[PDB]
Design a binder for these strands. Structure first.
Ligand SMILES: [Zn+2]
Ligand SMILES: [Zn+2]
Ligand SMILES: [Zn+2]
Ligand SMILES: [Zn+2]
Lengths: 25, 81
DNA sequence: TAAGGACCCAGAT
DNA sequence: AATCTGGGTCCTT
């Protein structure tokens, strides 16, 4: 929820789940 | 450069500095002192805390070499100079 | 090159 | 009075 990707806007509950998604783009 | 906190909308400066601000809201303390088990929100706060166990004193007086753990102790010391 | 790591500091406990 | 909180900037791959 509070960790929001600034490229695709997907929301992630923890910081690692946000940084896990940074490799998608 | 900077980002708005999605909880309180405050602008937080610094690439990579939002998570530490968010933890002021969540109370998450991911960093733990290996010795006394005390936990901290921030890696840099843990690092200063470990000086209590290691006795390290990185603040050095260039005049006499007196060594301190905190910069304000060093500041206090430099009056004698 | 993000962002980790380091350190400073104004205000608060 | 000393030490802490939270937010700032610089450096280094
Ligand atoms: Zn994304
Ligand atoms: Zn906030
Ligand atoms: Zn400790
Ligand atoms: Zn001295």
């Amino acid at each position: 929820k509070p960790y929001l990707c600034q490229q695709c806007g997907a929301a992630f509950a923890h910081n690692y789940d946000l940084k896990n998604h940074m490799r998608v783009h | 450069h900077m980002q708005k906190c999605p909880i309180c909308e405050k602008v937080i400066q610094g690439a990579g500095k939002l998570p530490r601000h968010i933890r002021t809201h969540t109370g998450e303390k991911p960093y733990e002192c290996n010795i006394c088990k005390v936990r901290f929100t921030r890696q840099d706060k843990l690092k200063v805390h470990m000086r209590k166990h290691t006795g390290e004193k990185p603040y050095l007086c260039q005049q006499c070499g007196a060594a301190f753990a905190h910069n304000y102790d060093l500041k206090n010391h430099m009056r004698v100079h």
